[PDB]
Amino acid sequence: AQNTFLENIVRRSNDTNFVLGNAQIVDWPIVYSNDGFCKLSGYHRAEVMQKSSACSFMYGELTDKDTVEKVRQTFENYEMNSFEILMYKKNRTPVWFFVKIAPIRNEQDKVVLFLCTFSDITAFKQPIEDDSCKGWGKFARLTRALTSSRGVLQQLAPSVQKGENVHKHSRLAEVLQLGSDILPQYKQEAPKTPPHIILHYCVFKTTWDWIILILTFYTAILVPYNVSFKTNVAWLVVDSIVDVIFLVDIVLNFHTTFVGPAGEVISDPKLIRMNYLKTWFVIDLLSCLFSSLKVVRLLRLGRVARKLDHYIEYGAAVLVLLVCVFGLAAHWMACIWYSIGDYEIFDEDTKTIRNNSWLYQLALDIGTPYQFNKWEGGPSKNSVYISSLYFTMTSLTSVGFGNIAPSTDIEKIFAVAIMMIGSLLYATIFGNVTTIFQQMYANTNRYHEMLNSVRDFLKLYQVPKGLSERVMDYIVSTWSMSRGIDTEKVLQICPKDMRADICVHLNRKVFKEHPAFRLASDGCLRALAMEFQTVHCAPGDLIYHAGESVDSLCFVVSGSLEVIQDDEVVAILGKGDVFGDVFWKEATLAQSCANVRALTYCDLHVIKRDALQKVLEFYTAFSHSFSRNLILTYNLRKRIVFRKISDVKREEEERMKRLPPDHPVRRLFQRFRQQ
Amino acid sequence: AQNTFLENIVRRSNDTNFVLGNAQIVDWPIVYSNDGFCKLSGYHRAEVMQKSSACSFMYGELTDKDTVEKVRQTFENYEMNSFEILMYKKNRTPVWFFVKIAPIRNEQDKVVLFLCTFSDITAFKQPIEDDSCKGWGKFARLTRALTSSRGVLQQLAPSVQKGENVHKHSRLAEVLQLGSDILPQYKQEAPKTPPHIILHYCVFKTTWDWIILILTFYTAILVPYNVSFKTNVAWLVVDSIVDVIFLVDIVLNFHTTFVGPAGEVISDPKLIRMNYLKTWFVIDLLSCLFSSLKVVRLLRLGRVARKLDHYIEYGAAVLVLLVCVFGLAAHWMACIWYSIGDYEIFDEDTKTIRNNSWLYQLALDIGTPYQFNKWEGGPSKNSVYISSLYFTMTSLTSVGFGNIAPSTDIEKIFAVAIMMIGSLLYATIFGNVTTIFQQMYANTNRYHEMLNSVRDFLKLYQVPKGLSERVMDYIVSTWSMSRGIDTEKVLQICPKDMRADICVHLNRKVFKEHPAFRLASDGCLRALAMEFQTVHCAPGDLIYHAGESVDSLCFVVSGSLEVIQDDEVVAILGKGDVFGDVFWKEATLAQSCANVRALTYCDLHVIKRDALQKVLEFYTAFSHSFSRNLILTYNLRKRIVFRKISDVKREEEERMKRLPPDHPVRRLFQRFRQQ
């Protein structure tokens, strides 16, 4: 989803110059000029912009003012038109421009821009000079001006005569077909392929690829079973059905889109055809095709290579893939095993059984042995396939019972083959199970490693039982709350815009509730929220000590706090209360008067003095509003004088009961008088 | 454990306004006012706080002073009362407040706060104005004041008449029931559920979940054994016993607490019932329930899913879980194997044995074959279960001996099934063993990797044998001491309060023993200990070179040091000796006069000059005490002049033995005279 506005214009353009103006701003200021307009006008892009889209700076005394009034009327009524006006350049040469002005709509169908396309009718109108070396020189300057039409586009004209109307019609007809083609509408819309070209990540294409994965699995089950065991007519019916489906997939893989390394999407049918024909098309056509060649239908699962990169990333998905590959290879080498047994049981022209094959031993094991009439069969075909899959499963699972077990020469060659293949299939199943378990236990074991390091540290340094239980409680609580998420790292992945917007959403509990912040600009809100820090505190986990530096005013967005000065609660802070020190007015660091113990699990939103002062020095219009609207709930700097009632009572009891010292004492008293 | 003091008040309150005062501070200063009191009083929270809890700022000339004296008596005797007083607002409107004053106890049952709850009796007393637009306007202002009672709570009153006493009784009876309900006592107590609701992490509930895990294991062993092998009356007795226990678990899972993603605990019985009925209750009731349905008692181990998240994290615990799951699945598919053999041995109505099944081959193997009378049995039922568990264990362990080995059609279908299941069970056992070994060898192999990098570095850069052995000795010694604990990282996990308190405990060996630090404030102690660095040194591993910058005064908290100036020991530093340079008085960096070699394994506690100067500039009252009480044991800055006895002896021997040079020499001499 993008707004590919300019790219459409320069794609359809073929070297035509244009500028864009506003359709809602008075005098219609130029917002964009392409480089060809900078070459044609003789100006920079900086001096062209914020001039009028009617090119008022190119007007002159030779310009007809009624054409100017028609152009301004065209801008006033928002209609497509075209005009031919003598306008000036930066070197003031009279140039007969062909303008083609067109409004540009919105997604909401409101006109928002004026696209005006430019060309030159200098050679086709007349030469006029205020002063020149020659009439020939004025003609030469006119031919050097009118270049993009005559020298490039209208090249079949100047051999022929009477070409003025024809060249004007060609140059205007390019823009006239563009008047329906380039209506680019200035919308951030989704990029589209031409129709009859289906998308790669489409829902229909995804379920189509899933049902063709199911059908490749179907054919890989059934085709070796058919060619090995030599079996109705509904099976040929569904064979024709799945062949039709695979040829429909041939057509769909011809018509689909594609992802390359540089091109994230592919839109062109010749591009997808050239990408198709090298790799995929020849093996898929070799699959989609006398009976002995039917094994090449096993190349159908070559297109499961396309699902390869869909599900090669996920560990459980590649485990499910390898379990299916294990069972499929079991069926394949079961069919190979039956083919070997059926070869070996009647490899002799003398019709001898040789008394030794897995087929004959399976028959003699289960009953119904072989006998001749002819040569009457022994075991059932379904029982033979069941036992053959059983044998191949015993050899692939490395179980190896040995009921069905190889006993002749090519049987043991195949046994060596299946065991060396099944070793590696069993190993790769074990490897993906181990990889699944390590990638599913890594985030647990790193947490347990951090926790064991902390427990060993607090055991080693003889930290007391209360403080160590406190630290361990904090660590398990913040892990259970945060789910092991480094919030700084998750912010660092994002760019600066998303980082600021995420931080504004995190500190919305301050910025929507405080009257100091209800006047904040959007940029000031970003610049504040990038320096805010949300701080969670446990009950009894105090924030400021007595005498600690108060460098951070905190907004209690959740929970409750108490302010203990001299063992006495002085202020309870609730939801949406601001404490700390008034930094912008104090301009000095002070020690905290009082402890700030936390009553409940509380969420504060602190902000350091240096960061807040940076933001308030940069947003000078906001800083006065902050100073006028942020009343601190509790100044931690100011000392609150009081008396305890118990001490006042005891002093009243003592007042009811009741110069050599004064000379080293009144001195100090006078010092306090000077204080 | 928290002190949910305000939340209880605003939960029971239903929009009643209140302030809190101190019960031990004279004049009873307001420590908290809710937002409704800010709306009612017409003030901010900042101007209300530190005023008296009797609302002295709202007194006026129309206020009766004897009601004031009764209120101050109520504050003096610490008793619950209620009063109706005309008090002023910020816009000085006379308001008939209903106060309800109540003391608030402690966990130690001492009164510590005054909660006074507020309401309006403005409409119910009288209109009185100093000046007004109208008596009707004064009535309108009174109706706008008395809002929270009449417009909201007392809404059944104003249709009826004679409602004054009734509305006053209702508004005071809310607070009168609250006078027993909200006695919130201001204690950091544990949060409690209502009784007959049992805790999640409780010790009784944990051992209950463990015995029900044991019983689910019991039923998963016995129920397939029963339904497969078709077995007294004490077994039905213990069946009824365990069914009673499972229904007791139904009741307990109805009445327990619960943990959600947002809610860490759940206290409500309707909440736990609604959480129960979707997922757990329907499958547990399907479990806790003609004989052919007994297999659904295997759904009892669905509640072992609840222990899932108790022990899915620990690697050895999930290995023990998977070993038990392996053995349990062995027993299950052993029962399935016996059921298949018992089906296949008499699948014929002709009572033929077919000469081929694992049961018949096991009978013919071990003796006592099958014979008919009727059809007399072969092997013992216990021997059949033993051999069936043996077969299923051979197929799950991928051993596959082949005594007992499948030979018929559905037997080999089951064999393929058990081998494909046992492959993945064997793989996941192998994966958890590999994960256990990697997470138990990671902290060893990262240490060996660091040590190998160091040995390769000291081999590569041709560092000499003595220095390389020294570095390697340091590295293995600090690993054996620290157990591989990044002390900076373990501090960084903690918040600022716990970080400071841990650092104060780490530097307690300085802060309890030094007379310079016995005057330190608590905040100054935190601000010092966050910048202290404990430094361990090896014997012969010197700290300061000759001429090195002395930017850190060190406290030798353990071990002994020697100070070598010019190959001569000048001072031995023992436990609790401070050396370095007197930074606050010097205010310049100097070179060290002498080497400071370490005698034993010593622990110093250094602190850099810049950090110490920051702390002493911020704690100006502490800095003078530090300067007066910290005598440096050895000034490393000052040069100590002396003479060696051997050189004095040799010079005495030479003194007993004994202008063209002076002109380039006496000049220098005079320079030294100007020095």
Author numbering:
A (entry chain C), B (entry chain A): 13 to 243, 247 to 304, 323 to 406, 412 to 696, 704 to 720
Copied sentences from the primary study:
Voltage-gated potassium channels (Kvs) conduct potassium ions in response to changes in membrane voltage. Kvs 10–12 have three intracellular domains: an N-terminal Per-ARNT-Sim domain (PAS), a C-terminal C-linker domain, and a C-terminal cyclic nucleotide binding homology domain (CNBHD).
Therefore, we determined the Cryo-EM structure of Eag1 Δ3–13 in the presence of calcium and bound to CaM (Eag1 Δ3–13/CaM) (c and Figure 6—figure supplements 1, 2, 3 and 4). The rotation observed in these conformations is in a similar direction as the intracellular domains in the open conformation structure of hErg. As a result, we believe that conformation 1 and conformation 2 represent pre-open conformations of Eag1 on the pathway from closed to fully open. Instead, we think that more likely CaM binding to the channel helps to stabilize the hydrophobic interaction between the PAS loop C-terminus, Tyr 213, and Tyr 639.
